[PDB]
C-alpha cells in the first residue's frame, strides 16, 4: 500500500488556499469566493519515483476562530503556509500561523513550506526577496504559486511531501 | 406593524413544513425590506426555489443564494450588496434571523437562522428578524447538516411569501 501524507493548507482568508487545492485536485481554477469552513481532499501522485496518497485539509482563514485550529494542527504532518503576494497583511500573518503550529506540535522542526500565491498578478506588494529571507530564517522552502495559471502548484505540494519524507 | 414572511421547506422535493419569520422593520427597515421583497419575489427574483446550502447542527441553517445556488452568490434589492444597517440586535439564541456576509458592508441575500446562541457574531452580522412559528422545522432541517455544513439532502424553499 502507498504511504499517505496528511497535508494541511493554512493562511489568512482569501489568499487562495482553496484555489490552490482545487487546482491540484481537480485541474480547475475557482474564480468565485467561497470562504471555507473545512474541506478534505485525496489525490494519488508520484514524487521522486514513489507513489503516495495526499490527504489534504483545506482550512478556514477566519481570524475569529484561531483557537479552533489547534485540533487540526495536532493531526497534520506538514503545512503549507500561504500568503498572497499582493496582500502584505497576509504575509505578516504568516508568523502567527507558524508560531501556532510550533506551539501545538511542541516542536521547532515541523515540515512546512512557505507559499506566496497569486504570482500571476501584476501589483505585487510582497517582494520575492522578502519572502525568501523569511523562509530562510524559518529553515523552510519558499515557492511562488498561481492557482490561476497552475505555476508552482504541484511544486508546492510535492515539496511539502519531500519535507515530510526528510523530517 | 412588522411584516411576517413564510418559507415552505422541502427535503428532496417533499414537504417538510412551514417556518414563518417576524422581520424587525422597526429596528432595521432597510434590511427587513430586502428580505421581505426577496420572499415575495416582487422584484422578479428571490428566495423561491433556492436551497439551504450550509447547515451545521448546533449552530445555524444558512441559505439565500438564489443566483448561483452554490453558496457564493445572491443579491439584494438595492444592488449586489448593501451596507450594514446597524448591529442593535444580538444573536441571543435559537430562531434569530441574521444576514450572512463576506466582511463589512457586504449584505446581499444570504441569511442564516440560528439554532443556538452565537454571541461572537454580534457586531459582525446584522440581526433583522426571528422565527415566529415553525422553529421545529428549522430543528428538523438540522437533521440534514454536517460538521462542515454540507447537506445530506437538498433542502429547498419550495414556496415563500408574505403573510397578512
Ligand atoms: C473553525 C471552524 N468554524 C466554525 C466553528 C466554530 C466553533 N466554535 C466553538 C467555540 N465557540 C466559542 C465558545 C464561543 C465559537 C465557535 C465550533 N465549530 C465550528 C465548526 C463546526 O468546525 C468545523 C465556524 C466557522 C465559520 C467559518 C469558517 C470556519 C468555522 C466561516 C467561513 S465563511 C463564514 N464563516 C461567514 C459566512 N460567510 C459566507 O458564507 C459568505 C459567502 C460568500 O459571500 C456570501 C457568503 C457567513 O456569513 N455565515 C453566517 C453566520 C455563520 C457562518 N456563516 C458559519 O457558517 O459559521 C459556522 C460556525 C460553526 C457557526 C462557526
Ligand atoms: N489572480 C488570482 N486569484 C486567485 C488566486 N488564488 C485565489 N484567487 C482568488 O482569490 C479569491 C479567494 O480565493 P480562495 O481560494 O477562496 O481563498 P482562501 O484562502 O481559500 N479563502 P478562505 O480562507 O476564506 O477559505 C477567489 O476569488 C479566487 O479566485 C491566484 O493564484 N491568482
Ligand atoms: Mg478556502
Residue numbers in the entry:
A (entry chain A): 0 to 166
B (entry chain D): 2 to 165
Q: What does the article say, verbatim?
A:
RAS family genes encode small GTPase proteins that regulate cell proliferation in response to growth factor stimuli. Here we describe RMC-7977, a reversible, tri-complex RAS inhibitor with broad-spectrum activity for the active state of both mutant and wild-type KRAS, NRAS and HRAS variants (a RAS(ON) multi-selective inhibitor). The binary CYPA–compound complex then binds to active RAS (with dissociation constant Kd2) to form a tri-complex structure in which CYPA sterically occludes RAS–effector interactions.
All residues in the binding site are identical among HRAS, KRAS and NRAS, and RMC-7977 is equipotent across these RAS isoforms. Kd2 measurements for all three wild-type RAS proteins were approximately 100 nM (KRAS Kd2 = 116 nM, NRAS Kd2 =  101 nM and HRAS Kd2 = 94.7 nM). RMC-7977 exhibited similar activity for wild-type and mutant RAS variants in biochemical assays, and in the live-cell nano-BRET assay the cellular potency for inhibition of CRAF (RBD) binding to wild-type KRAS was only modestly lower than that for the oncogenic variants.
